[model samples]
Target chain A: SKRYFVTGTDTEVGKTVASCALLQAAKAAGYRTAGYKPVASGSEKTPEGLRNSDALALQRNSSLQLDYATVNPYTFAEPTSPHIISAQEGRPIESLVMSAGLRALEQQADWVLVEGAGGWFTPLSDTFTFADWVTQEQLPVILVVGVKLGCINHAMLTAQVIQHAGLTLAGWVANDVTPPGKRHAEYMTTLTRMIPAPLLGEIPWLAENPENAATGKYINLALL
Target chain B: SKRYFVTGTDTEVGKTVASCALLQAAKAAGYRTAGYKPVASGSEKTPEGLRNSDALALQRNSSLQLDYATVNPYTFAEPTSPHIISAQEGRPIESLVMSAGLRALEQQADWVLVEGAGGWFTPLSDTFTFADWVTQEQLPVILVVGVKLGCINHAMLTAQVIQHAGLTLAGWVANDVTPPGKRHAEYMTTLTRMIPAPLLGEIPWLAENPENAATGKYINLALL
Candidate 1:
């Protein structure tokens, strides 16, 4: 089965939107797919009861429907630094739990799009983060660049940390979630040219907004 | 009101234990007390839906019983940072949410103790931190200094952040949470003098590992 790991430069940079869209694009391109978020926090009550939007987005974009528990093993109500949460709660995020979730997804899907939470350096605990878990899991990472002011710097820093964590940068996805006031095309194009990976897709700012980004379109995953 | 916001120089520096002891101390000093933790992440489900051990310790320590929801308004389950959880869930920790809890407690308690989930530098959301929350509530902070290797640097940097955020250094609690290491005396002596706040109390680790450090100890609040 083919799969890829998608991560972002920072939180609110539309990583989930790009990742779910990529899953849809991969699925429409005749790839059977599943979604995996090793750890998900801050869920709200859906008709389904305590649904995580990131997991929901991935499940929606996938060719196969996934159980919420399978998609995200950990869910917290407060948004916080992972380590503080772990220490406060006395349960750290382990790569073993994440791998188990992925192994289960591997059974039914052709291409499992694994999504990571937060920026590259954001820790899951004082000792580990989702990035560290990703490194230990050894997934080939796909960078999600939020093209806006300081995209170059944030992208570069994120890329550097991923490299430091010893993961391969398989490709990149860019969405126009730049700062409220900035030159869109200029910043994105520069980022596209500079980030050291294949530009899998340059998503449109016109319609690539988070709430509606996933089901709206398809970009070729072969380029990824 | 006689209150203190418990923040630490680093994680596992005994913030909860200090908070528990301070509750005892405050109550002994003829004050009805309350505490609040606005956002709690990386938690587990007991018979109760979702709870954090640190928060639980506070609940156990306080004389009055507190319902889970009143203590922590937003509890995220992922061992990931609050920003990531908030992003994934789309509901970041808001100052208003925390303020309501603080205000309610302020009206009820002679001393309202608030505990930050982790280190002073720990992030709650992308643009927010534990220090930011304390600043928003305008709490006089009693920093917990866990004397060990690198305590000086951590304390100095954290002190700058706390003061920069416009919170008072009410006093500090010093505890040797580390193993009875060689540097405790040297570290505490210099720190008590350099740390701009009064050294509230210093507790020695039990000789044989008493399960609860603050259980039978009396606090001398003369420093405060």
Candidate 2:
């Protein structure tokens, strides 16, 4: 079984979009895929329960039909840092729950993409970050670089920290969250030259709302 | 002499604003102050030459009267990454130039604040970053955390990288680039608990156009 943790430079930097794309690509390559979001903040209350848009999107992309509770073990209603929400509600996020959730997904799928909230070092509790849990799990990381004005620094910092923590930076996808800048090509070229990882894909702004298969075509599964 | 490097979490995260506040604070504390911008990409052309708005802001905040060229040594036309601008303009930004400019400012002022163009790992050239130059100089760093939705992660990553590089994270300033969020106080508390540095100040949104002196009052000089 192959599993990878997908993280972005910052929140709203398209971690969900890239994770969905990767799941679609893996499914097309004849692998049963699972998209797992261990902990999610900023959710909507439905009859079913608190539902996060990210987790829902992940469910839609996964080849395996998993329950929402299995995909996201911890869900918070506030759209802030998980740790803050945890503190306010007196519910501490547990790594054991996260790990068990991943283990269950692994049994049912050939490839699992674990999407993290916000960024790598986002706090789960007062003391532990999402990075801390990932390090413990020894999960190989796939970074999603949000192409913007100051992305070079954020991406480099993230990649450096990932390697520094003794995790493999498997590859990276450059997702255009905004309309491409005038020097967008140059920015892409710079990230390609600097990062010590393969360029998995360059995703343009999906303003047209293309299908998952259409979006997955931009990703090069062969590189992985 | 007290010389510090001010870097933001990302570009437009109020490094210059925070630096100016620091300069003004130091001035109020009876220290002769100077602000240095070693490299700046976005600039406006004047009869004298190219002058960056950030460099100009620094010059205005300085207690000492200095020429524009002395404060900012390298200024480029485009408002993008300095490395990209350097490549396009065929002028490689040299660390020697950056150091010399800093050294010159240090002589005239008791307190010198060296402001970086973007974030900590912003590229100066193909092989070097602003972080590299700061590391080489062994300058103590003061981070300016732009309080936004994803600032906690960005701030932590930058701070971690700064310490990992063996530099002193002297202090940090929380600059509200946007209006305060509903959970703004909680975000501040989370960062205060997590970051291993003193909270130099918590600057609110300055939409009312406060004076440099008024802004400086928000900062705590004794912490540094």
Q: Largest DockQ belongs to which candidate?
A: 2
Docking class of 1: incorrect
* TM-score of model 1 (CA atoms): 0.49
TM-score list, all predictions? 0.49, 0.97
Ten-residue stretch with the least lDDT total in model 2 chain A:
A206-215
Model 2 misplaced regions, further than 4 Å: A210-213, B210-213
Candidate 2 CAPRI-style tier: high
What lDDT tens digits, residue by residue, belong to model 2 across residues B36-66? 8888887898898998988898898999999
lDDT of 1 by residue, A106-181 (tens): 8988888888766654556644556667777788889887765434545654565566556889988877664444
How many clashing residue pairs appear in each of the predictions shown?
Answer: 19, 0
lDDT (0 to 1) per candidate: 0.69, 0.88
Global CA lDDT computed for model 2: 0.88
Which parts of model 1 are misplaced by more than 4 Å?
A1-224, B207-211, B215-218
